[PDB]
């Protein structure tokens, strides 16, 4: 006892086990107990993950203390040492697991049938041993004790299907409440339950990580299990079965992958937000380990607050650098809170329903959502409407022949320097759930990237692309578009007109998927617009590329005695009070706007016969007008069928904005108005 | 009675159901499941599909039968056999092979055909299922789907040369020339510790003869998937098919194929220290049928 001394610590695991059991059984705040009902759902093979809400534990403690009964601080103990309480909760759950009310019906997962077989087999062994010892005729409690001591059951670790996760305390109700940057995650925090706020960089693909490898000895008819808790393990070759061990007869084992226990595995490598990096430093990353049903919850370019256990791992670096018991760390993920909700995860529940009703019932949804984009920017209403339509996006058609239409808008913001073009791109980046802000020539020098590197966790080569693939189902806000080299322009040709990227470089013969809406902002030729030169020369965009952009605003800068003084008043007020000046409307915060945009994206409106006739006539007239002024001073380019498609797309987006399944004639009129006034500032 | 351990399969019941499906399958059932009853033919639908197929199998002499799993879904009596086939590839496939041999020999016997049964009982018949459900891609296959039938479609990028795979070792006793042949079981070969003869016992008399072992074909095919659905920002993924026996050298580079097979996982050895395996398993697909 001298070699391994002892320390008394304030924690008593038995009292905390009793508290855990009582909390699980008797928590009703969220008819029946919440966790008992969850366990019942798990037993019926519905839920595979048990989420232990720490706020529930805190409320349980508050109830117990308020009535006067003494209850130990379970929440603090969980936060201080999270790893052990995982197993404590797991065993408490395994004790209180109810029995299924819906049996196997030939459609159940193979894991479930294997677990049921193991459970029935060990119960049969226990009962058989009880019967034998009772028949020997040498209280049933002693009999139970002796039979459970004398039998080799399948351990409870191999008869549980659910996964256990902890949800950190909400900050408003209340350490886990305060998210921390990667820099602040010091060595003092190991073993705790912390929340790391950052941006996910590189998520590997799901691969099976073995937890308990299972063997079979054909000679002795046993199944031997070898627990694995290391990145690397040593396989077994000689039988470990007790009876087969005493017997001197040779035994050989074989792996049984179907019998072994696996956990879905993923590594994420979150970085720091730009705001968290101190002055002069660069952001640094932190590994994240994802196990169980949390896989596929984290994607590259996600702003998240991952909550997990900050466990260490044995060092795998150079022995020269290792001076002591050096350890490399990671964060075993437990809860993932996306900072910006994805559009594909929208669900029309009452929570979003009430706020959507609040928006629509007040009316003026189009103007409110247009003005709410960058309220600090003044007077640029039409471009804000165009950006809103960009966010909503049109409807993409898929004819049975295989023909596909984009259903996405592309906006180009041409204009004189200093008209707040680049500000709107950043506002869109802050509104859109996914997006990339490429800029310039040197930065994002390859928007298309034919990068095929090696995955550190899995040796199989993964394909990596530029911002375009990261901007899948998003907006690729491109800045300084004109200064971009010709190679990226040629790639963006295909990216705008189709939704794919075709690569045939050395090592890669593939076709990436990038259904990305391109938003660009570039200055005209020779810096400012030169009214001497033709508009098609100031823009300097070839007709093939220019046709792709649905709307190309000109946003020229022209001095005025009234407009400029209004703009100066606006900007000076913004600098004085960090708020939008006017009190006529309260702006919609990006969360509410994003929710409404997702709801609108759910709808898929359709055109109308009279609407189709109006659009056809408008397209014919536009084509005639383009033919007439094919060489005038205002030749903004010959009209193309892409102009008709853009009219359709804008009309569908406007219909989506009103939450309608039927395209309206006034929507087409407004789309025509926007397309026409995109060049109105030219005069 | 007598379900196998770790499975929901009973040999007798599954063989009974498969024989029932073979005897009484008509393509009109698939038409009904396809909701294409307006296209029902009087000729082809009336005729018994698999019985006829087994006939031309007998005259032609082939040894492989291609089964459409949706036909199994069409037959009410074998709806459960469909799920049993998805969840338990190897067992159910072996059951099907034995049933095919049984049905062949029974059909010869019942009609008292002049064709001899010498070849039939000596031959080995194989069942190759296909059209087994949807694709689901590879990003969506969780580790619980190990050893299940999956359907994959994509482009064949690269095809490795033929790799011999040992089937029977040929250890030779140096002393008394006790040449025992050891078949491989579950990818394991067990060396005789000493000479298996009782009169002669010399552990060092064993020296494996590489050249006189009997091998089997194995070809690894690199398939880049083109799934019907792609998640946001997912670059194309490459998976490694592993064909065997007759399917070797069948799929050429640039072929756009749809492949069904068993989704497997195998430990990969960390070659830093020998006989030490990484805890992350490499995933590959055994191939049963190529369309």
């Amino acid at each position: 006892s001298a070699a391994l001394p002892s320390i008394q610590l304030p924690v008593d695991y038995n009292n905390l086990f009793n508290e855990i059991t009582d909390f699980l059984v008797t928590f009703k705040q969220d008819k029946g107990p919440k966790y008992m009902a969850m366990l019942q759902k798990v037993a019926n093979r519905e839920l595979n993950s048990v989420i232990i809400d720490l706020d529930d534990i805190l409320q349980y403690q508050n109830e117990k203390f308020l009535q006067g009964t003494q209850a130990d601080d379970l929440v603090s103990a969980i936060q201080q040492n999270a790893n052990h309480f995982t197993e404590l909760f797991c065993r408490a759950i395994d004790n209180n697991m109810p029995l299924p009310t819906k049996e196997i019906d030939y459609k159940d997962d193979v894991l479930d049938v294997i677990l049921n077989q193991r459970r029935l087999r060990n119960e049969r062994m226990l009962s058989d041993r009880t019967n034998e010892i009772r028949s020997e005729n040498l209280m049933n409690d002693a009999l139970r004790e002796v039979v459970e001591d004398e039998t080799e059951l399948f351990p409870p670790n191999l008869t549980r299907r659910y996964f256990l996760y902890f949800k950190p305390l909400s900050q408003n109700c209340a350490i886990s409440s305060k998210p921390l940057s990667v820099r602040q995650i010091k060595g003092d925090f190991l073993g705790q339950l912390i929340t790391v706020r950052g941006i996910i960089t590189r998520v590997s693909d799901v691969k099976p990580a073995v937890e308990v490898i299972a063997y079979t000895c054909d000679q002795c008819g046993y199944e031997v299990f070898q627990e694995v808790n290391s990145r690397t393990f040593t396989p077994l070759s000689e039988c470990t079965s007790e009876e087969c061990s005493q017997n001197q007869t040779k035994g050989q084992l074989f792996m049984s992958t179907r019998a072994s226990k696996f956990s879905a595995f993923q590594e994420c490598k979150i970085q720091e937000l730009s705001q968290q990096v101190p002055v002069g430093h660069i952001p640094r990353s932190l590994n994240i380990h994802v196990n169980g049903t949390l896989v596929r919850s984290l994607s590259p370019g996600d702003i998240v607050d991952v909550t997990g256990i900050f466990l260490p791992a044995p060092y795998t670096g150079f022995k020269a650098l290792k001076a002591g018991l050096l350890t490399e760390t990671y964060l075993e993920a437990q809860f993932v809170r996306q900072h910006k909700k994805k559009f594909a995860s929208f669900s029309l529940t009452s929570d979003v329903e009430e706020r959507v009703m609040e928006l629509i019932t007040s009316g003026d949804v189009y103007n409110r959502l247009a003005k709410s984009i960058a309220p600090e920017i003044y007077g640029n209403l039409d471009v804000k409407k165009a950006l809103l339509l960009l966010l909503v996006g049109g409807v993409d058609k898929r004819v049975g022949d295989g023909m596909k239409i984009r259903g996405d808008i592309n906006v180009c913001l041409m204009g004189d320097p200093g008209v707040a073009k680049s500000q709107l791109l950043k506002a869109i980046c802050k509104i859109s759930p996914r997006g990339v802000y490429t800029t310039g020539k040197g930065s994002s020098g390859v928007g298309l990237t034919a990068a095929v590197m090696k995955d550190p966790v899995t040796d199989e080569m993964i394909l990596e692309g530029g911002a375009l693939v990261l901007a899948d189902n998003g907006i690729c806000c491109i800045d300084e578009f004109d200064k971009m080299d010709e190679s990226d322009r040629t790639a963006i040709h295909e990216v705008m007109e189709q939704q794919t990227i075709s690569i045939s470089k050395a090592g890669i013969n593939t076709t990436l998927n990038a259904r990305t809406s391109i938003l660009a902002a570039a200055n005209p030729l020779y810096g400012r617009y030169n009214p001497r030169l033709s508009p098609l020369d100031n823009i300097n965009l070839p007709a093939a590329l220019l046709s792709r952009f649905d709307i190309l605003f000109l946003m020229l800068d022209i001095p005025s005695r009234d407009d400029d003084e209004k703009l100066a008043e606006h900007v000076t007020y913004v600098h004085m009070h960090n708020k939008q000046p006017d009190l006529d409307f309260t702006p919609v915060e990006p969360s509410k706007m994003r929710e409404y945009i997702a709801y609108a994206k759910t709808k898929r409106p359709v055109m109308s016969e009279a609407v189709n006739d109006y659009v056809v006539q408008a397209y014919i007239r536009l084509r005639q007008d383009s033919k007439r002024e094919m060489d005038s001073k205002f030749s903004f380019g010959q009209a193309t069928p892409r102009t008709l498609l853009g009219i359709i797309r804008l009309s569908q987006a406007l219909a989506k904005l009103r939450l309608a399944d039927m395209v309206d004639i006034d929507d087409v009129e407004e789309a025509l108005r926007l397309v026409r006034v995109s060049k109105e500032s030219l005069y | 009675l007598r379900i196998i351990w770790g499975t929901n399969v009973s040999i007798q019941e599954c063989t009974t159901n498969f024989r029932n499906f073979l005897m009484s399958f008509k393509y009109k059932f698939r038409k009904i499941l396809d909701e294409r009853e307006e296209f029902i033919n009087n000729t082809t639908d009336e005729e018994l599909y698999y019985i006829k197929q087994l006939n031309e199998m007998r005259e032609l002499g082939t040894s492989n039968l291609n089964l459409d799993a949706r036909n199994l879904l069409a037959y009410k009596q074998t709806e459960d056999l469909y799920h049993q086939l998805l969840n338990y590839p190897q067992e159910v496939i072996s059951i099907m092979d034995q049933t095919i041999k049984d049905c062949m020999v029974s059909l010869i016997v019942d009609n008292n055909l002049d064709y001899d049964l010498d070849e039939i009982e000596t031959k080995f018949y194989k069942v190759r299922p296909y059209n087994v459900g949807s694709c689901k891609g590879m990003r969506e296959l969780n580790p619980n789907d190990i050893d299940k039938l999956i359907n994959l479609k994509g482009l064949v990028l690269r095809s490795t040369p033929v790799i011999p795979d040992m089937k029977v070792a040929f250890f030779k006793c140096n002393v008394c020339d006790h040449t025992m042949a050891v078949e491989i079981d579950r990818g394991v070969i067990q060396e005789p510790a000493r000479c298996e003869r009782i009169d002669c016992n010399e552990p060092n008399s064993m020296s494996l003869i590489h050249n006189r072992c009997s091998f089997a074909d194995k070809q690894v095919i690199k398939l880049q998937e083109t799934p019907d659905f792609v998640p946001d920002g997912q670059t194309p993924h490459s998976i490694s098919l592993c064909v065997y026996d007759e399917l070797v050298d069948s799929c050429r580079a640039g072929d756009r194929i749809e492949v069904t097979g068993t989704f497997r996982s195998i430990p990969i050895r960390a070659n830093s220290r020998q006989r030490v395996l990484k805890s992350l398993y490499k995933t590959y697909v055994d191939v049963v049928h190529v369309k």
């Binding site: 029935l120 | 379900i3 196998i4 351990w5």
Partner: peptide
């Protein structure tokens, strides 16, 4: 060889 009783489940 792997045969066991059918009362395990259905």
């Amino acid at each position: 060889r792997l045969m066991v009783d059918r009362k395990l489940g259905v």
